[PDB]
Amino acid sequence: GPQPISRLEQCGINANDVKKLEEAGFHTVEAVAYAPKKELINIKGISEAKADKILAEAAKLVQITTGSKELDKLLQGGIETGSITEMFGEFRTGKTQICHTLAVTCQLPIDRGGGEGKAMYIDTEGTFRPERLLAVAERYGLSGSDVLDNVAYARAFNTDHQTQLLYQASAMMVESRYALLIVDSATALYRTDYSGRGELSARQMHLARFLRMLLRLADEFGVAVVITNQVVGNIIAHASTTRLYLRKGRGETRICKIYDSPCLPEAEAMFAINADGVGDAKD
Amino acid sequence: GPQPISRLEQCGINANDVKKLEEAGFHTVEAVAYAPKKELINIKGISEAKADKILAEAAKLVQITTGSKELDKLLQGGIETGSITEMFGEFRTGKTQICHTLAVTCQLPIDRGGGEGKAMYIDTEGTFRPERLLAVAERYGLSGSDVLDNVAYARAFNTDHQTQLLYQASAMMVESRYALLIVDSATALYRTDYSGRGELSARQMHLARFLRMLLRLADEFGVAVVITNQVVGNIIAHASTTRLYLRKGRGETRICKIYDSPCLPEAEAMFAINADGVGDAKD
Amino acid sequence: GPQPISRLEQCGINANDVKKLEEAGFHTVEAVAYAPKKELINIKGISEAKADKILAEAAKLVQITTGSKELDKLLQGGIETGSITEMFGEFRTGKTQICHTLAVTCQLPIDRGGGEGKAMYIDTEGTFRPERLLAVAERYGLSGSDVLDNVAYARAFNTDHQTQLLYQASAMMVESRYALLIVDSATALYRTDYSGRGELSARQMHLARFLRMLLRLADEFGVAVVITNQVVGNIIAHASTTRLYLRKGRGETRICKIYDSPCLPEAEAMFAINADGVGDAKD
């Protein structure tokens, strides 16, 4: 399991540097331990000696239904909890709609295709609609009020705030059972904030660390990690376990394709976006 | 609510840098706080040390009827105040006419579908006509003189002046209740001023900051933000909540289509442009 | 009103740079003030430091009858003084004839549809005919000699000379009341002078500055600004308030159409070109 980074402070790292590591997004001794010097050195106010002391002392201690049956079959029954699933597609393909649907379906009983856990929606694009969550809840006969009470929401204004919310998510996810973490327009802040060309490596490093934190949180809490990508990077490939390509069919009916999964076939399924739901295509 | 940036000077930022931030368009501690270093560094006469001092001390503190029934039905009753609604369409489709109509309808009672608030028209294209406001006021039986007395008007000559007017708008909108802010040819000054190709990133940055200021003012005063775009940007998508495509039907009758809304359907409504009003199509 | 640029020199801009700004065509503190840095930097013999000093110190201080009744009805009574009215049409449609007629009608009493002011004809195409002015004066019973005495004429040899004449026009228009400024083949010199493709942005910038100077003079003196364009720029659309499309009807009778006006309908009116006058069609 995890080894929360608090224990690293008893090794004699000072607590301020541990706070800087938590701000960076390292929350376990496992997390600090299996990384090279440069990760800790790149943090502001950390020299090579402090990074070597951290690594040295760290080595001492150490299926959610989509609600579309065709899509569930495409996924062999739904998202695997504990792993990151990326859905990349054009704008208006229904990524946000799928997120809203899953934010409620996660709360469904496991026998009903849920995870019996609360949902987490981190929004960067303003598209969060509690009324859509209410619609999905009424679709499955779930209490809309309890759905909104079991979904904690916060809009990230920048990449630093986007990573900082993970610090609150890790501590908050310990007290209550969650099953779904949603990050909508996850890549948008890396394009709007970091727009220059010399700063590309900085946003790539921040994204890499963010993805590693996502995988860490997935393995730590056994929750589903959902991130949304606008396709107007090869780094996500090794990190994402299931890549879904979304494209528009005219009207409100969307085509979904699987474009990489080591376990799931590359395959396609047709679905629609209905007021209640993300739901099977009904010609 | 807001945390006006004035309090930041008591943290020990010098007042000249606070004046530079207000000129830049940051008016709350919230506004400075959730932005990265580069925003403050890019401002003229601000080094990285002053930006770091600002961010560090900042972290310590921190439905308007359109008067066309068919259009109201399309919007489910009218614009949501507190959010940006973008109407993109060809020239001569009636964007300016809609602006003139809304500038008066905003003052209508909330039961008559207004906001019971004053209007703000920032013009960049010269198309401001008080007589059109008088016609809309007499249409809804509002005093045309009081409508013009409750509409403050100023023509922006450039992008810098366009952003500078927001500083007067934020302080002026505190003393009186407003419900509608209109920015007509909002993108025209970014094309006339920034006409080169190497300066495209500069106009994109200025537009991004301007849009963020619009969102900030919308969340601060709970007013409706209306901006007009000529379609002869993808940045507006995450920022705009409702995208409307306007196209001409021959004669004076115009077709309206919804092209993105996370909550509103993609749908169309037919309307006309009448001397009194922007008003439903009447074959 | 205006704030003539002379006061800017007392702010401590050196006088040579003020002379360069006046040659460039900036004549008021308002004019220097509401423009971005690149306008002043692009002027020859002006560095970035002088432009920043100018903008900084500048911020411290800051219906004429057409004589065709049908056309008057089309315009709701005639040109609005203080604004630019553009008439775009093919060659030989009568743009120049309308200019000659207005050059005299402007001197008519206000009760007769005039402005009771002198006329200004800036010619670039050689088509200036004092005898046409005499014919219009005798039609409406105005003294032809006094009409020629109230019309100041000058032929622009190039785009730079065309803009330079505005410097003499601004100072000369202060001593006497004028009501009409005519620029005939206003776009021809930007085609004959700037004929290359790499120099397109230069002529577009010069035209933009020229149009801004026109708007400045219009707001300063409350005169009508008339420019003629041969259609064998999109920038003029936002700047021009009323666009009129002129096309030939065979013989000497011309069709006029309104192609944009926020206040005037899209509509057409038939008129003729008569020896005395630009005058209504009389089948």
Swiss-Prot record, chains A, B, C:
It is found in: Nucleus; Cytoplasm; Cytoplasm, Perinuclear region; Mitochondrion matrix. Residues 146-219 are annotated as: Interaction with PALB2. One of its GO terms (biological process) is regulation of DNA damage checkpoint. Residues 28-57 form the HhH domain. InterPro entries: AAA+_ATPase (IPR003593), DNA_recomb/repair_Rad51 (IPR011941), DNA_recomb/repair_Rad51_C (IPR013632), DNA_recomb/repair_RecA-like (IPR016467), DNA_repair_Rad51/TF_NusA_a-hlx (IPR010995), P-loop_NTPase (IPR027417), RecA_ATP-bd (IPR020588), RecA_monomer-monomer_interface (IPR020587). GO terms for cellular component: centrosome; chromatin; chromosome, telomeric region; condensed chromosome; condensed nuclear chromosome; cytoplasm; cytosol; lateral element. Ubiquitinated by the SCF(FBH1) E3 ubiquitin ligase complex, regulating RAD51 subcellular location and preventing its association with DNA. Ubiquitinated by RFWD3 in response to DNA damage: ubiquitination leads to degradation by the proteasome, promoting homologous recombination. Phosphorylation of Thr-253 by CHEK1 may enhance association with chromatin at sites of DNA damage and promote DNA repair by homologous recombination. Phosphorylation by ABL1 inhibits function. There is a cross-link at K38, K44 (Glycyl lysine isopeptide (Lys-Gly) (interchain with G-Cter in ubiquitin)). It comes from the Eukaryota. The modification Phosphothreonine is found at T253. Its main location: nucleus. Keywords: Acetylation, ATP-binding, Chromosome, Cytoplasm, Cytoskeleton, Disease variant, DNA damage, DNA recombination, DNA repair, DNA-binding, Fanconi anemia, Isopeptide bond, Mitochondrion, Nucleotide-binding, Nucleus, Phosphoprotein, Ubl conjugation. GO terms for molecular function: ATP binding; ATP hydrolysis activity; ATP-dependent activity, acting on DNA; ATP-dependent DNA damage sensor activity; chromatin binding; DNA polymerase binding; DNA strand exchange activity; double-stranded DNA binding. SMART domains: AAA. SUPFAM superfamilies: P-loop containing nucleoside triphosphate hydrolases, Rad51 N-terminal domain-like. ATP binds at G89, E90, F91, R92, T93, G94, K95, T96. Belongs to the RecA family. RAD51 subfamily. Plays an important role in homologous strand exchange, a key step in DNA repair through homologous recombination (HR). Binds to single-stranded DNA in an ATP-dependent manner to form nucleoprotein filaments which are essential for the homology search and strand exchange. Catalyzes the recognition of homology and strand exchange between homologous DNA partners to form a joint molecule between a processed DNA break and the repair template. Recruited to resolve stalled replication forks during replication stress. The nuclear localization may reside in the C-terminus (between 259 and 339 AA). It is linked to Breast cancer: A common malignancy originating from breast epithelial tissue. Breast neoplasms can be distinguished by their histologic pattern. Invasive ductal carcinoma is by far the most common type. Breast cancer is etiologically and genetically heterogeneous. Important genetic factors have been indicated by familial occurrence and bilateral involvement. Mutations at more than one locus can be involved in different families or even in the same case. Mirror movements 2: A disorder characterized by contralateral involuntary movements that mirror voluntary ones. While mirror movements are occasionally found in young children, persistence beyond the age of 10 is abnormal. Mirror movements occur more commonly in the upper extremities. Forms linear homooligomers, giving rise to a RAD51 nucleoprotein filament, which is essential for strand-pairing reactions during DNA recombination. Interacts with BRCA1 and either directly or indirectly with p53. Interacts with XRCC3, RAD54L and RAD54B. Interacts with the BCDX2 subcomplex RAD51C:RAD51B. Component of the homologous recombination repair (HR) complex composed of ERCC5/XPG, BRCA2, PALB2, DSS1 and RAD51. Interacts directly with PALB2 which may serve as a scaffold for a HR complex containing PALB2, BRCA2, RAD51C, RAD51 and XRCC3. Interacts with RAD51AP1 and RAD51AP2. This is DNA repair protein RAD51 homolog 1. It comes from Homo sapiens. The gene is RAD51.
